[PDB]
A paper describes a structure:
The [name]-[name]-[name] (MRN) complex is a central, multifunctional factor in the detection, signaling and nucleolytic processing of DNA double-strand breaks (DSBs). The core MR complex contains two copies of both the ATPase [name] and the endo-/exonuclease [name], assembled in an elongated structure. This structure consists of a “head” module which includes [name] and the ATP binding cassette type nucleotide binding domains (NBDs) of [name], and a “tail” module formed by the coiled-coil domains (CCDs) of [name]. Furthermore, MRN/X’s nuclease is highly regulated by trans-interacting factors that interact with a regulatory surface patch on [name], denoted “S site”.
The highest resolution structures were obtained by incubating MR or MH129NRN (nuclease dead mutant, hereafter referred to as ‘MRN’) with 50 bp DNA and ATP at 35 °C for 30 min, followed by addition of BeFx (producing the ATP mimic ADP•BeFx after ATP hydrolysis). Extensive processing resulted in 3D reconstructions with overall resolutions of 3.2 Å (MR) and 3.1 Å (MRN). The maps resolve MR’s and MRN’s catalytic head bound to DNA and parts of the CCD module, with ADP•BeFx•Mg2+ bound at both active sites. Human MR/MRN comprises two tightly engaged RAD50NBDs that bind into the concave side of the [name] dimer. The nuclease active site of [name] harbors density consistent with two Mn2+ ions (present in the buffer) but is shielded from any DNA access by the proximity of RAD50NBDs. DNA interacts with both RAD50NBDs in a two-fold symmetric manner, traversing the [name] dimer between the CCDs with a footprint of ~20 bases, consistent with ATP dependent DNA binding. The 3’ strand, as viewed from a DSB, binds to the RAD50NBD N-lobe along the top β-strand of the S site and to the subsequent α-helix, while the 5’ strand binds the N-lobe at a loop following the P-loop helix (Walker A motif). [name] does not substantially contribute to DNA binding in this state, with only a single residue (K467MRE11) at the HLH element in sufficient proximity to the 3’ strand. DNA interactions are virtually identical in MR and in MRN complexes. During 3D classification, we identified two separable conformational states in MR and MRN, one with the [name] dimer symmetrically attached to both RAD50NBDs, and one where the [name] catalytic domain dimer detaches as a rigid body from one RAD50NBD.
Author numbering:
A (entry chain D): 8 to 401, 427 to 511
B (entry chain E): 7 to 401, 426 to 509
C (entry chain A): 1 to 243, 1069 to 1312
D (entry chain B): 1 to 245, 1071 to 1312
Write the structure that this text describes.
Amino acid sequence: DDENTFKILVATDIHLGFMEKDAVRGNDTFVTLDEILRLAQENEVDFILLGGDLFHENKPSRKTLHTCLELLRKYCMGDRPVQFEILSDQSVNFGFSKFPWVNYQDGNLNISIPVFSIHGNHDDPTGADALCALDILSCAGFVNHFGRSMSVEKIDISPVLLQKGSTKIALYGLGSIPDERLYRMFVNKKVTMLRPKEDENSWFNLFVIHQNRSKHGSTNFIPEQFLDDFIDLVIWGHEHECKIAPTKNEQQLFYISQPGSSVVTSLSPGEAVKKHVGLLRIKGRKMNMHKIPLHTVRQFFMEDIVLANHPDIFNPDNPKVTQAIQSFCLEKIEEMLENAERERLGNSHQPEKPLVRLRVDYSGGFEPFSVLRFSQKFVDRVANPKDIIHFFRHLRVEDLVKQYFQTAEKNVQLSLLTERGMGEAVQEFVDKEEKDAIEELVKYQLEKTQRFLKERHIDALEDKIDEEVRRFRETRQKN
Amino acid sequence: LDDENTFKILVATDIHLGFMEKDAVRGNDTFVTLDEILRLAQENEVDFILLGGDLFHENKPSRKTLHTCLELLRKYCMGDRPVQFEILSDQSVNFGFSKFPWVNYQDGNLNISIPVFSIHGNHDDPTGADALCALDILSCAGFVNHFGRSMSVEKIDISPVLLQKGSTKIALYGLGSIPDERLYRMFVNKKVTMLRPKEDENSWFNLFVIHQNRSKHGSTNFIPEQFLDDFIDLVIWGHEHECKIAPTKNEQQLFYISQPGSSVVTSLSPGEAVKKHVGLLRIKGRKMNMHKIPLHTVRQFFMEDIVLANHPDIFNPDNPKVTQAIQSFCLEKIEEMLENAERERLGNSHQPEKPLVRLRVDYSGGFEPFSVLRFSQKFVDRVANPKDIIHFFRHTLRVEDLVKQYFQTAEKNVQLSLLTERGMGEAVQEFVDKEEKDAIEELVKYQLEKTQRFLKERHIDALEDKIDEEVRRFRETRQ
Amino acid sequence: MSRIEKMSILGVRSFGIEDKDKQIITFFSPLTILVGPNGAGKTTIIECLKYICTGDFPPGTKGNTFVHDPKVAQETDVRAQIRLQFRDVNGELIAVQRSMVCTQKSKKTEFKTLEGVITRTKHGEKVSLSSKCAEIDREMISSLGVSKAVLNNVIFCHQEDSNWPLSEGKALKQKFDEIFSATRYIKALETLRQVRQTQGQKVKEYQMELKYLKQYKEKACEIRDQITSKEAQLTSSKEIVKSRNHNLALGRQKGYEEEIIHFKKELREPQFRDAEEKYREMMIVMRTTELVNKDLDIYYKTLDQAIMKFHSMKMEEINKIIRDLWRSTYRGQDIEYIEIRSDADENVSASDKRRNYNYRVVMLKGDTALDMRGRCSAGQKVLASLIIRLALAETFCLNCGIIALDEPTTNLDRENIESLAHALVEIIKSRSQQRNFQLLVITHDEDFVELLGRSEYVEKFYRIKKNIDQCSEIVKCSVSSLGFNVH
Amino acid sequence: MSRIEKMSILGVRSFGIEDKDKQIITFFSPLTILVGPNGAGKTTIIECLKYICTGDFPPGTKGNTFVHDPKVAQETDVRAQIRLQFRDVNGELIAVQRSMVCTQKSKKTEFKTLEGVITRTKHGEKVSLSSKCAEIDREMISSLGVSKAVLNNVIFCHQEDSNWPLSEGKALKQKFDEIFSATRYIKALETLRQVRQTQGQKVKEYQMELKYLKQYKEKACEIRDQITSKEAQLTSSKEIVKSYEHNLALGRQKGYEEEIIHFKKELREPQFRDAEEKYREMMIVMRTTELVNKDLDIYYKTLDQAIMKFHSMKMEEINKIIRDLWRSTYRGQDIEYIEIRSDADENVSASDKRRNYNYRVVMLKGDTALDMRGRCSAGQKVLASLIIRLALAETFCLNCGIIALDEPTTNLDRENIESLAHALVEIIKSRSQQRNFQLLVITHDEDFVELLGRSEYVEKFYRIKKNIDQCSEIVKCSVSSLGFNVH
DNA sequence: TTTTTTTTTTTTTTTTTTTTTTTTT
DNA sequence: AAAAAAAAAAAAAAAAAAAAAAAAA
Ligand SMILES: Nc1ncnc2c1ncn2[C@@H]1O[C@H](COP(=O)(O)OP(=O)(O)O)[C@@H](O)[C@H]1O
Ligand SMILES: Nc1ncnc2c1ncn2[C@@H]1O[C@H](COP(=O)(O)OP(=O)(O)O)[C@@H](O)[C@H]1O
Ligand code: BEF
Ligand code: BEF
Ligand SMILES: [Mg+2]
Ligand SMILES: [Mg+2]
Ligand SMILES: [Mn+2]
Ligand SMILES: [Mn+2]
């Protein structure tokens, strides 16, 4: 470290108010932000670079906004002077506000460690005047909101220029934008990154972007190929998986850092990796990133079980397989809890309630058990008593009625109607559209039986007529 | 006259920011009046701004209203001008419930030119587990000193805010808008106390700021005059949008009561038709002198109360076209009030063009109100409230008699055939009153058998006309 | 001045069987906000209140499903009880405790209403006398000062049985004949119609009876005439020829005699013994019944007209209130006002198989009176039903100021919600003088509660939520955690 | 696949009459958001979509109220015209259009549907065939790739009919019957039952005629036997006369001849001139009709059993989807899962006056299967119906991505709203990977819109608000102007 | 105290009328 | 353009059930 080291405590996706109403999950994101601010203060970083999503809710509640403002007043404010200057015109980068200057450039506030930040997809400008929570913070004089897009047609990313000694930074900001729109602008070359004209090649070009990185949709993701080649690093933000280690791009030769969220917002198998915040050190045109673990975030452990992939203790038929799968999941959850207990040693700040998830795929024909009676076991032992277990998986009426009529004609005794005679009338009704097929068949059989009975001169006796019609039905069906 | 011993306090109350912020006509109406209040404070070189609560209309202010309030407070309340008074009281009690108990201008990282001492109103009362209000956000940002908030529901102890400028000592008592039922209980139970200064309790102006109801028909839900602290010298009283800003003593109270009134017409009651003003209190040791200042940016409100019973010359009850006369009279009243608004407008140039005009009609003698949807379509572009232009308000039938009347009228109109006259009316009366499942089929039975019997004994030939002729003859002998 | 005070729920819906989960809710005045998750017991509390006040179960459910299910409780029988403590119009403390037993047998569950209690102070008597269902209902109706229909529809309206003003003609007619206490006269109307239809089916049977009796009469008269002619021939031949042909005469005599005796024995068969009298009597009965049917039809028509006239006479005042309420509450210039219009069918007869009712709520869009039902939005329907209930509460409920609004802000936009909050606040302010108003808003909207709390402040609200074993515990929370439950 | 693109609503409900007031709405992908005040015609757009897709008016209304009222428009008649532009399953553009007229005939309103037009673009030529309603419906079904019942109930469910999965057994069975495309077989069941009932009535009639004829047969046989006896006595008298060769016996023979001729005249009476064959034939007819009636009973029972077995087999597959959706998107701890259970009637018969249908959805609390209908919460019912509709869309409709939720978060609480938004986001993400998916959402809450728009961000929504002339205006606004409407 | 019998209410399947649709005239 | 015949639905009606009241024991 020297007069030219640009120590920047890069953080990203510090959601605030995530499960604030939750009794056990509340007051956890605020603790993580407090730890982040403590790290920045202890390390004497020049400023904090937030990648967006500083607030989970688009309109943060009173509690979250108040806690964030209290933490900012406690840490970001101080008597320490700022060792770097801004060479870009602040009337453009922060020109949206009625005070278009950086917070420490204002004489009414004594800012020690400023906080440059962009806006994520959770807190983006919405409203008639296009306000965001970061805009409220900037109006209060705590956070320098930069990189906001000011147009819906063309995005001209004007950088904010920083100078500490001989080290120069061209900080580019791009707030989160609807992903399809940003992709359609990238393919149509409607986005241009303005560069400082003086000393063009000596600026350490830094880019902060809040966009999808992995395979999410056809247009709902920003491939790295569309970013300009002149960038040197690109913090990424929208991805909550922790990838603090910069990665080399074999196609364009610019580094990529993915700080990842501080808190586990989603139960995907990407948040299981421990969350770290970066500590960027920049000298001239050389970047060195040192990660610092977060000890105030509850561990997230999840495992994937495919019952169809275990044809050894989970037989598809297995009349007593519900107990087997329930016991297997019980042992899995218990092992996860033991692992959480054994890793919690040496850490007095990590909350004593791990996040436990268990995705089960019964694609083989198994049936899920009660998630509602297999969580009562871990009501007070996990931080998510409800989402402990997730269950997911990856004939014609004519034939049925024909077979039912076939069974009926052979199971019961027909008095007058011929064997296999209605069933072919119902098929005529439903297939040939003849709306009087049943009536016509019934009347035909009635008339035939009446004519036969008249011809044979039966007596007016119930038993005699019954026997006669039975014998007629049993003899005339042959031909 | 102003000197080193004259507290120039700007008294505002019920600003109600964010009122109808989504209405096109009256959206930015409140942040124009707030801007004028702050400009009046700045151009008068006031020591500080005292607010009587209800600074925010919504309990959870939206992003736009909060952002505009922060913008105006940063623009006006913040400056390089030094403060001229000191707080000779422990700030950990009056400015409690915050992690920065010191006053906003005593912070080393804040440059406050005109401090604001504000209480919390009923609209923005503290709600939540931590009991925070929008005033708490403004205090944390470092703009407004939220004072006079109740501690516990058991008993309230109003800790004073002791500030002085030279030889002028003023104790700033403050009380939040606690629900008015609790305050009546807490007054009759004597569970209330105003801690006097620890020494020299003779030289203190004892300015008390309260935001509660006042003399009204709600005797259970209001705090009466007197029935309070006796050694006060001025009780600013908000929650009363009617402007009685002139401090007027009562018959025997020995303390002046001021009612600054709101800075925006929130409700369309006749009380708010009066002009809105601003305080500009001046205190010199123990002398009080409040100079009201008109609010030019406040939208005009015109209310006329008419009743149709007291105008019998034109509004004749039981008239074929009284509704047209009423509509014409209301139209003339609206036109005269709009013309009055137009005449009053040219005296200045800051009032919004569209005035708030509304009259209430009290048809009670029997009138059909005209189509208020067609009276007020003639005024879409000439009133700020196109819908609430006209208000309409006001202030045996036995079934047995009706059924008896209908029965007798039907019997007199059309003659019966066999049933005796007036019999079935009493039959159904007995059925209803004596709640027995008879007297209807029994009246029918009785009558049928009497008539049938007679018709036989009299030896009547079985034909068509003769039988009904004789049954009619037998029926007529009943009378 | 009836004021509910406290009420305990045990074994009803999901509320626990043992006498340890007996949740108690103390109703505040003038605002009692109930909030909680989906399920819980928010509407179950109103159901219990209505069951205690009237004895009527929630719509779509008999007593079988109202009680805690014996299968879910893993018990053979479930005993439920609701105890409401309240004050009557004279301001005296009354406590009524109803009971019920599901006692499921085999596969199909059963139900039985146990005897209630009318525990009431009389110089410290606290007499817990046991009463039957009818006595309980009549005592509750007398003490509350409001009829069963008002309690069922206006005061305690079930969430499912809301928008009942926007119902079919017959349903609305029979809800405003029970609110207007004219059910006895319409039960008499149905009795008249049933009697007329019964006599018409007797007449229809008598048609064929008369046909066959006429045939028998013709046969009997023919054989009588042929008897008399044969007897005349016999006697004439006797006295002509008795005064060879002499023995031929005697043979003819014996032939005529056998003819006469066989004819007479044919006459003595029941079908012809006396058919003139039977035919006459049946004709008399038929004509008499037909004339009585005509008279019954006339009387049914005039009584129906009288009932409809009485309904209109009450409806004019109720509509006078409804118009003002709608014009003050509805935030939209497309319906000028609403009212409830009814008129009797012109060609109404007691013999009609289907009688069409024309009781409807009419929207006055512009200058025409369209019918609200079938061409109103969900929001307008909700607002109109709420306004009609509020109007019926002002007219009929002046000795009971309880009005339970179960999620009033459903399918209502922002402006209408603010206007409804303003209207409810004004109603509370105006009806809280010399009386005790009590609103029972049960909502899931934070904004509506926050508008209702600025005036007529709430100090405590009831949050209903499940416990570990899904029992719907009722917990009383001060106003410092409201946002934990509202949306 | 099968994505709707454009609409032109004119003269329907509150929409204006003249061409100047004809409104155009373009549906976005994957999420279209419709907001506006109460009334104003937001649901009317879904009604027009359903009417142009299937030809069915909203439930509880006919064409008289669907069209703009001529009295309100102050015109003698009102002509409405909905035009929908969409791509079929293959991808070709079609521009179906439907026209109706509602003339004012005296007091009543006469309704009539004009011939619609089908516009299939082909090699740059826009054909236009003035097809009738049947061809229009057939082409719409063949183009959208889904059945009419699916379009009616799963896709374009009306706001008032959104809770159809929790209706009575008959209605639910009929809905899942037309959905399962097995309504022809229940029409066959219906005609079987009607034929048995008419045959039973005919059998009852034959038996009273049988009473009357057996009497005629007995009379005819008695008089025939007596005629034979008299002829035998006449022969005996003739033999005695021959033995004498007696004039008294000659007179006896003459009287016997008179008896014989008179009784032969009596036999010639049409009452029993041929009763021997008539009574026998009518008894034969009665017996054969009752035997056919018994066979009809047996076959009706067999067909009923077959139809419910088919219903259960078809429901078995979608029950798993319903269970998974309920487990994933229900935040409460009340019900483990829900499913639809259909139970056939073992004692069913065509002679039953009233049938018993056991079609129901069940809430499985713990291990006991309860009846969800009746005893479910309001929000629980809303969520259950939404889950049923989502599963029905997942199963049957794979060639029609559209699904259209008219205020899905009607009674849902905070966490249920959040879970429903999460589920809808997952559905959008899963179904839009390969084929087009559209999720038209009329709504009035802005915490649901935010949660929905966090993933698959919406950029333009539609504000549907009335104008000065009290028509309905469909305007397009950017996301920045979204909070002015939703609450 | 139990049992059986009839009465009354309700949920829900059924029937009726009317209006639009289709076919012929 | 007209007649009349039929298909559809919705709203009133009726069956069936299930509990309460009674009325015998
Ligand atoms: N007979 C019953 N036995 C057990 N639980 C029931 C029974 N009937 C309803 N429930 C459950 O009890 C609760 C009653 O819901 P309700 O109180 O109406 O809900 P809300 O308060 O949300 O309107 C629901 O969770 C419902 O599923
Ligand atoms: N036949 C009709 N003629 C004129 N106006 C009608 C007619 N039918 C309904 N309306 C009105 O048109 C509007 C339709 O409301 P709707 O679209 O259902 O509301 P929402 O969009 O809030 O769900 C309402 O104002 C309704 O009163
Ligand atoms: F559909 Be509306 F908002 F009632
Ligand atoms: F379903 Be609950 F009544 F909101
Ligand atoms: Mg409810
Ligand atoms: Mg709607
Ligand atoms: Mn994030
Ligand atoms: Mn106030």
